Structure formats: structure tokens, C-alpha cells
Tab-separated table of C-alpha atoms and ligand atoms in Angstrom:
chain	number	residue	atom	x	y	z
N	1	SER	CA	-21.123	-29.393	-15.962
N	2	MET	CA	-19.646	-26.593	-13.836
N	3	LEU	CA	-16.396	-26.569	-15.968
N	4	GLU	CA	-15.667	-22.807	-15.439
N	5	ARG	CA	-12.808	-21.420	-13.357
N	6	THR	CA	-14.130	-19.402	-10.358
N	7	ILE	CA	-12.382	-15.984	-9.896
N	8	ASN	CA	-12.915	-13.641	-6.940
N	9	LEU	CA	-13.465	-9.943	-7.887
N	10	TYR	CA	-13.343	-7.100	-5.338
N	11	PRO	CA	-14.648	-3.537	-5.543
N	12	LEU	CA	-12.295	-0.994	-7.188
N	13	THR	CA	-12.716	1.041	-3.914
N	14	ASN	CA	-10.884	-1.857	-2.111
N	15	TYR	CA	-7.627	-0.844	-3.932
N	16	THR	CA	-5.338	2.168	-3.165
N	17	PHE	CA	-3.590	3.748	-6.235
N	18	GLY	CA	-0.495	5.603	-4.960
N	19	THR	CA	2.082	7.381	-7.208
N	20	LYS	CA	5.818	6.845	-7.864
N	21	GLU	CA	8.514	8.198	-10.260
N	22	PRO	CA	7.900	8.044	-14.048
N	23	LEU	CA	8.757	4.690	-15.699
N	24	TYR	CA	10.136	5.398	-19.204
N	25	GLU	CA	9.622	3.030	-22.201
N	26	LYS	CA	12.890	1.507	-23.602
N	27	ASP	CA	11.762	2.903	-26.994
N	28	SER	CA	11.198	6.657	-27.670
N	29	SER	CA	9.194	5.905	-30.922
N	30	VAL	CA	7.516	3.182	-33.072
N	31	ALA	CA	10.597	3.308	-35.356
N	32	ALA	CA	13.075	2.751	-32.420
N	33	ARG	CA	10.717	0.014	-31.114
N	34	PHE	CA	10.886	-2.016	-34.342
N	35	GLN	CA	14.694	-1.253	-34.719
N	36	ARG	CA	15.397	-2.695	-31.226
N	37	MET	CA	13.097	-5.724	-31.988
N	38	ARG	CA	15.198	-6.352	-35.167
N	39	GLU	CA	18.501	-5.961	-33.244
N	40	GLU	CA	17.433	-8.264	-30.389
N	41	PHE	CA	15.887	-10.854	-32.779
N	42	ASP	CA	19.364	-11.233	-34.434
N	43	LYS	CA	21.041	-11.706	-30.956
N	44	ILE	CA	18.487	-13.796	-28.942
N	45	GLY	CA	15.653	-14.681	-31.404
N	46	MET	CA	11.914	-14.294	-30.866
N	47	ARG	CA	10.806	-11.659	-28.312
N	48	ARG	CA	8.807	-13.214	-25.429
N	49	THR	CA	6.328	-10.783	-23.775
N	50	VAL	CA	3.903	-11.453	-20.901
N	51	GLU	CA	0.870	-9.332	-19.937
N	52	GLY	CA	-1.379	-9.428	-16.881
N	53	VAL	CA	-5.180	-8.991	-16.844
N	54	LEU	CA	-6.202	-7.562	-13.466
N	55	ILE	CA	-9.963	-7.437	-12.827
N	56	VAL	CA	-12.058	-5.550	-10.311
N	57	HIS	CA	-15.731	-4.679	-10.103
N	58	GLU	CA	-17.881	-1.739	-9.055
N	59	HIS	CA	-21.525	-2.583	-8.257
N	60	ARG	CA	-20.962	-6.086	-9.845
N	61	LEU	CA	-19.756	-4.644	-13.226
N	62	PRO	CA	-16.341	-6.183	-14.096
N	63	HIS	CA	-13.537	-3.751	-15.131
N	64	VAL	CA	-10.011	-4.485	-16.490
N	65	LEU	CA	-7.159	-2.302	-15.146
N	66	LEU	CA	-5.308	-0.627	-18.028
N	67	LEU	CA	-2.213	1.606	-18.022
N	68	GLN	CA	-2.658	4.785	-20.001
N	69	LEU	CA	0.624	6.381	-21.024
N	70	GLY	CA	-0.373	10.047	-20.330
N	71	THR	CA	-3.574	10.346	-22.442
N	72	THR	CA	-2.138	8.397	-25.475
N	73	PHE	CA	-2.149	4.522	-25.805
N	74	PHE	CA	-3.562	1.849	-23.425
N	75	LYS	CA	-1.526	-1.130	-22.318
N	76	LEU	CA	-1.755	-4.105	-20.017
N	77	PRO	CA	0.817	-4.324	-17.226
N	78	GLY	CA	3.603	-6.564	-18.502
N	79	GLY	CA	6.641	-6.542	-20.718
N	80	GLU	CA	9.610	-8.432	-22.073
N	81	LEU	CA	11.070	-11.623	-20.561
N	82	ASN	CA	14.839	-12.057	-20.362
N	83	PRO	CA	16.310	-15.073	-22.180
N	84	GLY	CA	15.662	-18.248	-20.136
N	85	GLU	CA	13.266	-16.449	-17.738
N	86	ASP	CA	10.117	-18.338	-16.616
N	87	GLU	CA	6.946	-16.685	-17.975
N	88	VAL	CA	5.069	-16.564	-14.626
N	89	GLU	CA	8.128	-15.442	-12.572
N	90	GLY	CA	8.719	-12.875	-15.302
N	91	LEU	CA	5.184	-11.453	-15.260
N	92	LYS	CA	5.387	-11.257	-11.413
N	93	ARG	CA	8.708	-9.355	-11.759
N	94	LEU	CA	7.287	-6.961	-14.390
N	95	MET	CA	4.038	-6.271	-12.470
N	96	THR	CA	6.233	-5.504	-9.323
N	97	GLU	CA	8.433	-3.119	-11.414
N	98	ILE	CA	5.312	-1.288	-12.789
N	99	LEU	CA	2.765	-1.321	-9.862
N	100	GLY	CA	4.878	-2.480	-6.821
N	101	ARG	CA	4.862	-0.229	-3.685
N	102	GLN	CA	7.340	2.664	-2.945
N	103	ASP	CA	7.598	1.252	0.665
N	104	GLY	CA	8.931	-2.135	-0.679
N	105	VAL	CA	6.345	-4.351	1.076
N	106	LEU	CA	6.084	-7.683	-0.728
N	107	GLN	CA	2.965	-7.905	-2.942
N	108	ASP	CA	1.331	-11.265	-3.588
N	109	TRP	CA	0.646	-11.874	-7.277
N	110	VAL	CA	-1.481	-14.987	-7.971
N	111	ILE	CA	-1.319	-16.204	-11.596
N	112	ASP	CA	-3.048	-19.554	-12.303
N	113	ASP	CA	-4.717	-19.028	-15.759
N	114	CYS	CA	-3.464	-18.454	-19.355
N	115	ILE	CA	-6.086	-16.448	-21.230
N	116	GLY	CA	-4.359	-16.228	-24.636
N	117	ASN	CA	-1.395	-16.164	-27.005
N	118	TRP	CA	-0.631	-13.599	-29.763
N	119	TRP	CA	2.111	-13.794	-32.406
N	120	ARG	CA	3.770	-10.987	-34.405
N	121	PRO	CA	4.979	-12.403	-37.732
N	122	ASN	CA	7.080	-9.364	-38.833
N	123	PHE	CA	8.793	-6.262	-37.388
N	124	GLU	CA	5.404	-4.496	-37.904
N	125	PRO	CA	2.335	-3.723	-35.768
N	126	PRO	CA	0.094	-6.698	-36.775
N	127	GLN	CA	-0.431	-9.454	-34.176
N	128	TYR	CA	-2.612	-12.580	-34.466
N	129	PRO	CA	-4.042	-15.131	-32.034
N	130	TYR	CA	-2.221	-17.898	-34.091
N	131	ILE	CA	1.071	-18.212	-36.131
N	132	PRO	CA	-0.037	-17.075	-39.633
N	133	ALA	CA	0.435	-19.254	-42.741
N	134	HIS	CA	4.025	-19.555	-44.057
N	135	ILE	CA	5.491	-17.884	-40.878
N	136	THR	CA	8.311	-20.078	-39.447
N	137	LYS	CA	10.174	-17.303	-37.501
N	138	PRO	CA	7.583	-15.186	-35.608
N	139	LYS	CA	9.336	-12.068	-34.212
N	140	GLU	CA	7.294	-11.864	-30.944
N	141	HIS	CA	5.210	-14.257	-28.845
N	142	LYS	CA	2.891	-12.513	-26.356
N	143	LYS	CA	1.286	-14.463	-23.478
N	144	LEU	CA	-1.725	-13.106	-21.519
N	145	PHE	CA	-2.456	-14.327	-17.957
N	146	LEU	CA	-5.316	-13.610	-15.558
N	147	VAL	CA	-3.898	-12.156	-12.307
N	148	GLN	CA	-6.122	-12.926	-9.242
N	149	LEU	CA	-5.976	-9.843	-7.002
N	150	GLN	CA	-6.079	-9.966	-3.214
N	151	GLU	CA	-9.154	-8.464	-1.420
N	152	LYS	CA	-7.136	-5.230	-0.849
N	153	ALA	CA	-3.826	-3.897	-2.188
N	154	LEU	CA	-1.832	-0.675	-2.545
N	155	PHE	CA	-0.474	-0.091	-6.086
N	156	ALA	CA	2.081	2.609	-6.927
N	157	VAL	CA	1.335	4.010	-10.414
N	158	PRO	CA	4.303	5.596	-12.225
N	159	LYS	CA	3.571	9.388	-12.351
N	160	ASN	CA	3.662	9.394	-16.238
N	161	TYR	CA	0.857	6.675	-16.394
N	162	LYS	CA	-2.862	6.686	-15.393
N	163	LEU	CA	-4.348	3.383	-14.042
N	164	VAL	CA	-7.892	3.300	-15.571
N	165	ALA	CA	-10.646	0.711	-14.801
N	166	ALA	CA	-12.298	-0.082	-18.198
N	167	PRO	CA	-15.701	-1.783	-18.150
N	168	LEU	CA	-15.959	-4.732	-20.563
N	169	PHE	CA	-18.639	-2.986	-22.712
N	170	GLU	CA	-16.135	-0.188	-23.476
N	171	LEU	CA	-13.543	-2.704	-24.727
N	172	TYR	CA	-15.970	-4.860	-26.718
N	173	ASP	CA	-15.713	-4.372	-30.556
N	174	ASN	CA	-13.405	-1.305	-29.869
N	175	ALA	CA	-10.157	-2.400	-31.674
N	176	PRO	CA	-9.658	1.155	-33.074
N	177	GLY	CA	-9.669	2.458	-29.432
N	178	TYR	CA	-7.752	-0.397	-27.720
N	179	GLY	CA	-6.336	-2.658	-30.444
N	180	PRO	CA	-7.116	-6.336	-31.102
N	181	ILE	CA	-5.784	-7.868	-27.851
N	182	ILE	CA	-7.453	-5.591	-25.267
N	183	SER	CA	-10.704	-5.318	-27.367
N	184	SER	CA	-11.002	-9.172	-27.314
N	185	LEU	CA	-10.710	-9.376	-23.477
N	186	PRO	CA	-14.556	-9.456	-23.021
N	187	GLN	CA	-14.683	-12.649	-25.149
N	188	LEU	CA	-11.535	-14.090	-23.457
N	189	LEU	CA	-12.955	-13.404	-19.909
N	190	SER	CA	-16.473	-14.752	-20.605
N	191	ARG	CA	-15.496	-18.327	-19.633
N	192	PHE	CA	-14.789	-17.305	-16.005
N	193	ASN	CA	-17.267	-17.606	-13.144
N	194	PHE	CA	-16.661	-14.227	-11.453
N	195	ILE	CA	-17.677	-13.846	-7.775
N	196	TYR	CA	-18.531	-10.164	-6.977
N	197	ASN	CA	-17.290	-9.758	-3.356
M	1	RWD	C1	-1.314	-3.967	-30.270
M	1	RWD	C2	-0.903	-2.919	-31.318
M	1	RWD	C3	-2.117	-2.609	-32.248
M	1	RWD	C4	-2.397	-3.659	-33.263
M	1	RWD	C5	-2.937	-3.491	-34.553
M	1	RWD	N1	-2.917	-4.791	-35.107
M	1	RWD	C6	-3.295	-5.219	-36.430
M	1	RWD	C7	-3.648	-6.568	-36.606
M	1	RWD	C8	-3.949	-7.049	-37.898
M	1	RWD	C9	-3.888	-6.185	-38.982
M	1	RWD	C10	-3.531	-4.840	-38.787
M	1	RWD	C11	-3.237	-4.342	-37.514
M	1	RWD	N2	-2.402	-5.680	-34.175
M	1	RWD	N3	-2.102	-5.039	-33.110
M	1	RWD	N4	0.270	-3.372	-32.101
M	1	RWD	C12	1.448	-2.741	-31.743
M	1	RWD	O1	2.538	-2.954	-32.246
M	1	RWD	C13	1.173	-1.762	-30.637
M	1	RWD	C14	-0.358	-1.592	-30.656
M	1	RWD	O2	-0.859	-1.492	-29.370
M	2	ZN	ZN1	-23.123	-2.000	-5.381
M	3	ZN	ZN1	5.597	-19.073	-30.124
């Protein structure tokens, strides 16, 4: 009757947030983003993205780590898989590219839980937690995973990003602020048995 996954959380003060060089988006605009998605869909088919949910606490209040591009949009650490690339190896690679240390010490990502799937039916912003009716060729499949952090770690945050710890209450029913994936993380995380270390 204990059917919940147990996840260790550590205080945000256990983590060091260093800095490194800016990491630029492949796309300079929404228009270029959907143009490249169109181009790549014709060459290699559906885009496969992976995103990591990294959780900490302060004073037993869980917080999700988000990347803020300057003071603009909020994203999860993650990105695009290469064709034939394993989802979990790919998320580990992407989280190393974004948050990995300037001193090149190997970081230990633990990924054991899928927490959701989102599908983009068109070359347009809307994403859904299912393949919508009549859609046979979704343009993007996004996979979210829970990343179990170590007790302590040093992260290097690209100088053009801020790493922000968002409490769940701030995400909850805040799609305008965070969009439909990040704003549904409180619901998606509720099944876990968090231990506040
Ligand atoms: C994740 C977002 C925002 C967003 C809005 N919608 C949505 C869903 C249903 C109906 C109308 C809008 N889905 N995702 N999509 C992007 O392309 C980047 C941005 O972060
Ligand atoms: Zn406390
Ligand atoms: Zn799919």
C-alpha cells in the first residue's frame, strides 16, 4: 500500500552554482525555431526532446530548478536527441552540456523515473500530454524524467542563463507564467514520496 517511489531531496544550500560561457540557442527566433523543425522533420522525422526535472528543498519546501534565459522564458534542462540516440544517455549528455563543470570532473546523473510525455501535432506552439485526434505524424515528442541529485554537486550555469529554484506553489495553475508542461509539474510530482534530507 506503499506504492510510491521514494526520492531523496537535499537543501538548495547543498549545491554550488558556478558560471561558464554563454550557451546560445540553435534558433534566434520562434520563426527560425519552427523553420528548422520543418526542415529536420523532412530529413529525419519527428523531433525527440528530453527534459530533466531536478528537485531540491529549502526548509522541507520542494523546488524545481528552472533555467531562465536572461529574464525572458523558463525552461527545463534538456534538449534534442540525435537520431538513434538513447533517451536516458541523451538527457545525461544534454544536462552535462548545460550544467556540467568547467573543471571537467565527471558528474553523476541518476535517472530512474519517467514523469510524462508531451506531443506537438504541428509546427506550432501547442503541446499535449497525448497524441491529439486525427494526428498520425506528430512533429515533436517530448519526454520528461525525474533526475535524482546527489547530496552535493557543483553546477556551472551558462552566463546568459539564471538557475532559479521555483517552489511548487508558484508553478501550480500558472500556465501563462510557465506554460502547460512546467505548470503541471506539481501534479506530476505529487506521486513521489520525497525525503527532506
Ligand atoms: C511550451 C511552450 C508554451 C505552450 C503553449 N501551449 C499551448 C497548448 C495548447 C493550446 C495553446 C497553447 N503549449 N505549450 N510551447 C512552445 O513552443 C515554447 C513554449 O515554452
Ligand atoms: Zn529548515
Ligand atoms: Zn511519440
